[PDB]
Each structure stands twice: as structure tokens, then as C-alpha cells.
């Protein structure tokens, strides 16, 4: 059903749509804090061994 | 804004005058649309002062 039935907004532009949609989720810090977390994860196993 | 733009010509090194963020188009602008053409017009006439 999802393959056979799909439509667009009636007059859309596919750069305005994305410059509006992708914008608010690029003020997060979890994508950096996981990089902080992987340091502790990698150093703890070296301290253990 | 017009008289402050004229007064800013004297104090070039201390203060600089720019057009606001909100006077630009939404995101990009899409020449397809009509309102952003007039936005471009207003901006391109305001900028040389």
C-alpha cells in the first residue's frame, strides 16, 4: 500500500522543505556526548586488562 | 533605519551597519515563489547604503 500510494505536497520545492525540516535537530549534543562516552568505554577495558 | 544608515557613514571604524537576518528570504528562496522575488528586490535595493 505504501508503495502503490504516495503523493507530494501540491507545489513543493525540495531544498526549501529540507532547509526548514533538517534545521531544528542540529542543536543537539548527544552526537558529541556519545563521542565523549566512547573514551571511557575504550579506556576502561585497557585499565582492566 | 534610513537616518541611522546615513549617520553610520561617519563612524565607519567604530560601528558597522548590516541588514537584519529577518529581511532575507525564508530559507533559500525558490524563484518559483512570488513573495521571495519581491524580498530579493527590497534587499537588492537596500544593500548599497
Amino acid at each position: 500500500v505504501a508503495l502503490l500510494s504516495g503523493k507530494y505536497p501540491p507545489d513543493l520545492v525540495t531544498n526549501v522543505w529540507y532547509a526548514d525540516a533538517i534545521y531544528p535537530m542540529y542543536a543537539d549534543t548527544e552526537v558529541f556526548s556519545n563521542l565523549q562516552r566512547d573514551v571511557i568505554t575504550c579506556e576502561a577495558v585497557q585499565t582492566l586488562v | 533605519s534610513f537616518r541611522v544608515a546615513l549617520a553610520g557613514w561617519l563612524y565607519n571604524g567604530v560601528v558597522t551597519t548590516v541588514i537584519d537576518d529577518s529581511s532575507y528570504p525564508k530559507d533559500g528562496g525558490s524563484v518559483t515563489s512570488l513573495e521571495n522575488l519581491w524580498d530579493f528586490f527590497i534587499l537588492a535595493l537596500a544593500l548599497p547604503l
Binding site: 520545492v13 | 515563489s33 512570488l34
Partner: peptide
């Protein structure tokens, strides 16, 4: 007057831009 009372009913019946749509709107 009735001239205003009918106009308010016409405005109550007949009620509610050219831009590319965004995900907010």
C-alpha cells in the same frame, strides 16, 4: 440594524498564500 446582522452571518459562513510549504506549516 438588519443590514449589519445579515453581514455578520455572511462573514460567519464565508470564513477561512503563495509560498512553498514547510514542515512547520
Amino acid at each position: 440594524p438588519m443590514s449589519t446582522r445579515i453581514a455578520e452571518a455572511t462573514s460567519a459562513i464565508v470564513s477561512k498564500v503563495g509560498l512553498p510549504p514547510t514542515a512547520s506549516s
